[PDB]
Write a protein that binds this ligand. Structure first.
Ligand code: PER
Ligand code: FE
Ligand code: FE
Length: 290
């Protein structure tokens, strides 16, 4: 009947209040955020957009990730404002640039080309990738065929199916970043232990953006052969906090007892982004058990 779209907007505003309340536990605000991401619409976009006020770089970058995945052009102005806001952490600005790419609307090409020259290397790289993704979409007439993951990725998977040839492409520092990302998503889609370990070798090369992406796709693939390397990266205090956070999230997704021990080990880490990732990951495991 017609009460459906009243009930949903009530639930949206309620969840929204939970998200923007800085006194709610972080795991509760993540839960609100991902529910809004699923529900979608203008109310949802506004409440997510309102949370960019927050102190947590972890939370703010998830906001931007969610707006990207929502693929709703209504988010574009807010994501531009985040991308341009030089006071935002690199991780946050990177995520807003990627999100502009994910929405796939060419209206944003000119800004993405501009920010391909941003002084913050994560941002520059992210926007280079997003310009190539927009160019790909334009040449192919839309998103690639749906693969095994429902995510909207920063690059379409490479056509090559041989894992060994994909590994070579991934680890080649002379190839363009976009081509390397394509081989990375093809590895993830190939699956199995050989591809998991080939991916995990990428935790020792490229830029910090590249390594973080490796972390994310290892968390999506969820293959346990990668745990030791994900836990070792998490443990490396010299590693970039954005990479260590992504590794922690991956460990969170896999959620095997050994992942859970590594996350507890780092729950008092000095890097706020790393502590909060471990918190949220452990809290989700506790929820599930309950
Ligand atoms: O982006 O971590
Ligand atoms: Fe990211
Ligand atoms: Fe991240």
């Amino acid at each position: 009947g017609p009460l459906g779209s009243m009930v949903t907007e009530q639930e949206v505003d309620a969840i929204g209040q939970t998200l923007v309340d800085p006194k709610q536990p972080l795991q509760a605000r993540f839960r609100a955020l991902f529910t809004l991401r699923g529900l979608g619409g203008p109310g949802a976009i506004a409440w997510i957009s309102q949370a960019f006020d927050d102190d947590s770089a972890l939370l703010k970058h998830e906001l931007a990730y969610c707006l990207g995945q929502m693929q709703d052009a209504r988010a574009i102005p807010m994501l531009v404002d985040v991308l341009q806001d030089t006071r935002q952490e690199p991780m946050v600005r990177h995520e807003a640039g990627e999100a502009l790419g994910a929405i796939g609307d060419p209206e944003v090409l000119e800004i993405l080309k501009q920010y391909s020259s941003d002084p913050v290397i994560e941002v520059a790289e992210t926007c280079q990738l997003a310009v190539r993704r927009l160019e790909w979409l334009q040449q192919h007439g839309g998103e690639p065929a749906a693969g095994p993951y429902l995510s909207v990725d920063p690059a379409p998977p490479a056509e090559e199916r041989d894992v060994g040839r994909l590994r070579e492409a991934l680890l080649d520092e002379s190839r363009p970043l976009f081509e390397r990302y394509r081989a990375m998503f093809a590895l993830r889609n190939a699956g199995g232990e050989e591809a998991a370990l080939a991916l995990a070798e990428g935790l020792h090369c490229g830029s910090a953006l590249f390594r973080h992406e490796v972390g994310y796709v290892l968390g999506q693939l969820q293959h346990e052969a990668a745990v030791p390397q994900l836990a070792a990266a998490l443990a490396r205090c010299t590693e970039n906090p954005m990479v260590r956070h992504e590794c922690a999230e991956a460990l969170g997704a896999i959620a095997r007892p050994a992942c859970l021990a590594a996350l507890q080990a780092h729950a008092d880490d000095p890097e706020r982004v790393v502590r909060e990732s471990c918190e949220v990951a452990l809290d989700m495991y506790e929820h599930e058990t309950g």
